[PDB]
Write a protein that binds this ligand. Sequence first.
Ligand SMILES: [Cl-]
Ligand SMILES: [Cl-]
Ligand SMILES: [Cl-]
Ligand SMILES: [Cl-]
Ligand SMILES: [Cl-]
Ligand SMILES: [Cl-]
Ligand SMILES: [Cl-]
Length: 129
Amino acid sequence: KVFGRCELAAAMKRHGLDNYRGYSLGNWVCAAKFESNFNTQATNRNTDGSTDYGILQINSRWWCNDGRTPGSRNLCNIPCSALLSSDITASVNCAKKIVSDGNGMNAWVAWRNRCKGTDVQAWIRGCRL
Ligand SMILES: [Cl-]
Ligand SMILES: [Cl-]
Ligand SMILES: [Cl-]
Ligand SMILES: [Cl-]
Ligand SMILES: [Cl-]
Ligand SMILES: [Cl-]
Ligand SMILES: [Cl-]
């Protein structure tokens, strides 16, 4: 599923991400924008043999099981395929654990490089919500 910007904002809020660990909804929308372009089925291979999955590009190195990332953990206790669902519940639940892990949203390198410090409220501008 490819979400609209306000559509995704609404789904994130509905799943309790809005202001989770102090990160406003715009931060999360901006992160999803640069990680997946709002596409739930986005997958990208890392040079180290791990893969990033879904709307927020969660890495198999730590967070989910894809059965092909030697020595990886599955800290969200989830198949990586569950992160590609049109329903964002799994991705959100896992993102909650990632953002709680000590470095906040810096865990998303695209967020640090393209969202951090910017006018992130633009992302939710005009959205009913
Ligand atoms: Cl957009
Ligand atoms: Cl915001
Ligand atoms: Cl594995
Ligand atoms: Cl699994
Ligand atoms: Cl959803
Ligand atoms: Cl923080
Ligand atoms: Cl709207």
